[PDB]
């Protein structure tokens, strides 16, 4: 999917609302299977959801993904943090719809999380913002 | 559904329209903070 979209460039723009509608509805479904996958889908579609300048969509993904940080399943949460990461690399610091004051301390307690992918993506993101 | 902590606390939300009622026997109607 990612390669298809990044290859299409901004010819894909009329198709976004269908995409991201599917992305949120799937972003629920039944948890452990597809959450991680829809999340990663966001992660790889970040730049396309950016350069075309759909800001509402960045609000969506920003606070919606912000809400899942309380997810107890690690294999999901990891993909969530990854998606957040990719969203940070497109929209900048001061323009983050979840202002960092909110986000970062909300990240801080997660570091106890044991299981791997969480620690990976988490530490990564704390790295991007901390840097 | 989700197949000394929240699950109790969750049970309240789900029935919260019934648990909390504009018509009750006795009560002092309170506005939550913000």
């Amino acid at each position: 999917f990612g390669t298809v979209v990044n290859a299409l460039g901004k010819r894909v723009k009329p198709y976004l609302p269908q995409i991201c509608g599917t992305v949120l509805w799937r972003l629920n479904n039944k948890s452990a299977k597809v959450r991680q996958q829809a999340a990663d889908l966001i992660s790889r579609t970040a730049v396309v959801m950016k350069t075309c300048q759909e800001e509402k969509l960045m609000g969506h993904l920003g606070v919606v993904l912000y809400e899942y940080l309380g997810e107890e399943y690690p294999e999901v949460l990891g993909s969530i943090l990854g998606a957040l990461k990719a969203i940070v690399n497109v929209i900048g610091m001061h323009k983050m719809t979840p202002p960092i004051k909110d986000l970062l301390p909300r990240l801080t307690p997660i570091l106890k999380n044991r299981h791997e992918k969480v620690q990976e993506n988490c530490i990564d993101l704390v790295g991007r913002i901390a840097d | 559904w989700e197949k000394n902590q929240i699950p109790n606390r969750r049970f309240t939300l789900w029935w919260s329209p019934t648990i909390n009622r504009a018509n009750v026997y006795v009560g002092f109607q309170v506005q939550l903070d913000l």
């Binding site: - | 000394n4 109790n8 049970f11 789900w14 029935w15 019934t18 648990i19 009622r21 009750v24 026997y25």
Partner: protein
């Protein structure tokens, strides 16, 4: 020790033969003695059928023994007492488990014991009252039965409930002696509307029937 033991005797002076096996208090009244009017009844009455003559030669009444009721009651009391912390959905699991534990086992004998029916009613009312305490209210309009009896698939507690049934009451003075029958009923528990609730006992097959069914099923299987 004579104290713990028990004896019963059947003789021309004593029609009835009482005994206790496992949890069951059993009485046996022949038809060769004075059975007077021959009658059927709820499945709490077993028919003892002569194997030779295929005839019903006597009747065995079942009654749930005292010590059993005591154990169940201490089990409910265990649920209330041992849980001050635990979640409300968790308690309902405890109740359901204990309650099917009683009912699947005793079945028929339950219906012929009034003391049980009372105990179940008051105990349902105690666990529901405790869940009430759990939030802060005792107010009935704030806990209609739909919240307790909804299968938690729809977000209720899934409480198995045997205690909305009517409780038969007749003539204490005579009922202590002659087994008069039922001239009255007492309301077990409240209903918001007229409404209804289903009882466990109706959905469980009685022990007698499952026995006969067992024999027939095996023979046919061979």
């Amino acid at each position: 020790q004579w104290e713990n033991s028990f004896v019963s005797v059947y003789s021309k002076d004593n029609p009835n033969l009482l005994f206790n096996m496992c949890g069951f208090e059993c009485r046996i009244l022949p038809k060769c003695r004075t059975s007077y009017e021959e009658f059927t009844h709820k499945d709490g009455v077993w028919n003892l059928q002569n194997e030779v003559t295929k005839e019903r030669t006597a009747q065995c009444f079942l009654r749930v023994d005292d010590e059993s009721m005591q154990r169940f009651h201490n089990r409910v009391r265990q649920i209330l007492m041992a849980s001050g912390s635990t979640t409300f959905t968790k308690i309902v699991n405890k109740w359901n488990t204990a309650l099917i534990g009683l009912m699947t086992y005793f079945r028929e004998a339950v219906v012929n014991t009034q003391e049980l029916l009372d105990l179940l009613v008051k105990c349902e009312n105690k666990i529901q009252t405790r869940i009430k305490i759990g939030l802060n209210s005792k107010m009935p309009s704030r806990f209609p039965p739909v919240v307790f009896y909804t299968p938690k698939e729809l977000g209720g507690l899934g409480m198995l409930s045997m205690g909305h049934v009517l409780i038969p009451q007749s003539d204490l003075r005579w009922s202590k002696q002659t087994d008069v029958g039922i001239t009255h009923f007492r309301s077990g528990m409240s209903h918001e509307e007229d409404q209804l609730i289903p009882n466990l006992y109706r959905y469980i097959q009685p022990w007698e029937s499952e026995f006969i069914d067992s024999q027939r099923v095996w023979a046919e299987y061979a």
